[PDB]
Symmetry: none
Subunit: 28 residues, 10 copies
């Protein structure tokens, strides 16, 4: 039913790649 | 039913690539 | 039924590419 | 039903790759 | 039902790869 | 400069009240 | 400069009140 | 500079109150 | 500079109150 | 610079109060 192909070429990674990132950084 | 092909070429990554990022950064 | 081909060439990435980003940044 | 192929080529990784990262960083 | 193939090539890893990382870093 | 008064009366709460909620729910 | 008064009356709470909630729920 | 007063009255709490909650729940 | 007053009245607590909770619950 | 007053009244606590909780619960 569902098919997916992923091909990634990264030289230098400082962020997110195929990732899920959560940052609160709230202030009260 | 659903087919998807992904091909990404990144040299330097400082952000998000194929990612899901959440940032609150709320203030009360 | 649904077919999709993605080909991306990025040199330097500081933002979002094929991503979903959410930022609150609310103020109360 | 669901099929997925992942192929990643990373030279230097300082962030997240195929990962799930959570950071509170809240302030009260 | 569910099939997944993972192939990762990392040279130097300073972050997370196929990982789940949690960091509080809260302040009261 | 900025002044704000909040007064909320809730009987039963199943959603968000004075909150900031983020839901990805993306599909690739 | 900034002043804020919060007064909340909740009977039964099943959601978020004065909170910041993040849910990935992504699918690859 | 910044002043904030919080007063909360909860009878039964099943969710989040003045909290920051992060849930991955990702699928690969 | 920053001042904050918190007053919470809870009868029965099954969730989070003035807390920071992180749950991976990822699937590969 | 930073001042914070916390006053909490709990009858029965089954969750987190002024706490930081981390739960992996990942699956591979």
């Amino acid at each position: 039913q569902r098919l997916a192909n992923f091909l990634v070429h990264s030289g230098n990674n400082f962020g997110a790649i195929l990732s899920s990132t959560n940052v609160g950084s709230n202030t009260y």
